[PDB]
């Protein structure tokens, strides 16, 4: 469940604003739905190779295909920064 | 990686569903940062709607308003009911 991680992010963006049980259920359904869309898409992309392998390249493509264009562009940049910070 | 979202469960979930036989170490980091980005976008807009309506908490109505007024979120997420 992403609810605790959604809560932590809510408190960085709106320190002084809370969230109802029903609203948090909606946020958590959004995140699960996107996860599955990106996972399914990355699964097709990786299906080309034997030993199907999902790397940051498959995720990056999956993001550029599934997300609307301006969301995709910001998400790709976020994805890239996080792998650069992890790597270095 | 800077993130609040969890990198750990992703590789296990992908293997256990046979989404792939192998997962690179960058893939879960990338994916968690993307999910965190989208949560932050929705929350920021939902919270703005709460504040604009003089509320101190986000309720379903605030998320519905946030998604409905945003062309890309409406496309990605679909309709929000109640």
């Amino acid at each position: 469940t992403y609810k605790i991680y959604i809560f932590k992010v809510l408190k960085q963006v709106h320190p002084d604003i809370g969230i109802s049980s029903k609203a948090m259920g909606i946020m958590n359904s959004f995140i699960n739905d996107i996860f599955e869309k990106l996972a399914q898409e990355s699964s097709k992309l990786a299906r080309y190779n034997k030993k199907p392998t999902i790397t940051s390249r498959e995720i990056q493509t999956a993001v550029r295909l599934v997300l609307p264009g301006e969301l995709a562009k910001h998400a790709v940049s976020e994805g890239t920064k996080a792998v650069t910070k992890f790597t270095s | 990686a800077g993130l609040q979202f969890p990198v750990g469960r992703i590789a296990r979930f992908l293997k256990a569903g046979k989404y792939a036989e192998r997962v690179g170490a960058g893939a879960p980091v990338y994916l968690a940062a993307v999910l965190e980005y989208l949560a932050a976008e929705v929350l920021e807009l939902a919270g703005n709607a709460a504040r604009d309506n003089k509320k101190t908490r986000i309720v379903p109505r605030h998320i519905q308003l946030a998604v409905r007024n945003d062309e890309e979120l409406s496309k990605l997420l679909g309709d929000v009911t109640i």
């Binding site: 809560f7 109802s20 049980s21 029903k22 609203a23 | -």
Partner: peptide
């Protein structure tokens, strides 16, 4: 009714 998360 919709209690705080």
């Amino acid at each position: 009714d919709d209690d705080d998360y």
